[PDB]
Amino acid sequence: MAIPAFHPGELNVYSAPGDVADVSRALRLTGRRVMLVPTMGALHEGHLALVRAAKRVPGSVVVVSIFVNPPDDDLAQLRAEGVEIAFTPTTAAMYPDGLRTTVQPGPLAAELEGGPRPTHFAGVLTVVLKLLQIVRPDRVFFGEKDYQQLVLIRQLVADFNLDVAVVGVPTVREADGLAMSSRNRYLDPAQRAAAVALSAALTAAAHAATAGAQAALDAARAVLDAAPGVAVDYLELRDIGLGPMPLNGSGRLLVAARLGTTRLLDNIAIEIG
């Protein structure tokens, strides 16, 4: 009946869904705007950019979930950013009845990433929906790196009439443009040097786009063709919702490739002509 302990301006950690739910509700009732940054831990500058984006909403309290969908470092990083709530549930707490009711994505989940991994997105949309129901944030923050994921989440939100604002945060990148990812550490020196071709192809495309869609795609393809040991799985230009690219106007160019055993993805905004 009592709200769990919450100390404002400190890092409060909760592993019970009902605790975080009760604290988030208590906080909402006192005025604060609840922001949710979902993560799977092993925090990097990309997650800090989602945190900083959430923190700048006036009156924000920031909830960072850390949950590996089937430590003290992460928490210290959150402490240093001024985050007030970490939600760190067990698999059992998230799934106390096992896998049962789930989210079935629309047919977009079968395209692109959904080729190698036909059910990956059902799993992501299920846990995102649960996290949104537990935390009930006013706004939820994702990076743009996994753009198809982001689009699928906006579809989830629209389709199930969720009241939350979905905020996409521009992808944080290394100095040479490589998109931040937990996988970059695995690249040896030759793979890491080759991997800059994804971001270089996409920026080349976004600039070639004054010359039209084919010039853009041909520019990206040429840059990827200049890289050794980059096995391109797809290179597609779509509209911003990931339907077919309209004759001109706004679009998104997406790429994925395998370098040795590591799969990399990147995407960029494209304006046609």
Place this chain on the structure above:
Amino acid sequence: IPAFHPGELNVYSAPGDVADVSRALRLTGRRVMLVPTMGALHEGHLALVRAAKRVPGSVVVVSIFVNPMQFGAGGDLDAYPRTPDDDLAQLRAEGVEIAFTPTTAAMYPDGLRTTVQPGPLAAELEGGPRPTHFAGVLTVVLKLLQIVRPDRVFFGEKDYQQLVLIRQLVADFNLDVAVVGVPTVREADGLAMSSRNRYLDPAQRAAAVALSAALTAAAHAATAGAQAALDAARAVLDAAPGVAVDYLELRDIGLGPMPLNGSGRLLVAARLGTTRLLDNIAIEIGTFA
């Protein structure tokens, strides 16, 4: 937020209208109760409404929407009874303050896209021959719950499988609503209320009492064990003219992957002519009875 006149029936079609009114009410302290229906309201629906009105400080939202996504090709969707005039008349007589009557286009502007995939219970019983039926039902109920954000939502027990799956949806997606099951309202002879009873001719209406007679016979027979309970119900169904049984099954109360213990639910579905009737009852086995 549009107009809300209290102590009157306010009808909203736009999801955003009822969402705004609901959230404003909740913030001024009223607890919001949802009774989701497919219209063609009968006294069983009025019992749901009365249950909801009984919650202190309640405001009652009754939704009316014949959801196309739970029907499969065939004439079933076109055939569903629609009596909107009667429906709204009844809600006013019960003192309901909000009816939410959305259009199909306002519910499904993008057609069918993201959906709820129920657990394996949805492929059994009523779902065996209708493999997407319960995905359709839970998808609309999820939407209704997110639009209205009620404190409690009320269902009849007559569609007991559906109520169980709804409890699963609420648990599995950490929804912040209480699910309230209300005991089935019956005609004087025991027949479960249903917007499909209008399709029984006089002979079928007479024979239809067999379902509820079979179930209560089984619940009293149950002191002698599950076989006796099942056999009593089967005997009554067999004695009845023109009743074709589709299934008669005794299950644990969650209908889930656990054997029957002391407490069960006995479920029956049968066709009288073209009309499929359902009914169910609580069963206590042996000492529990």
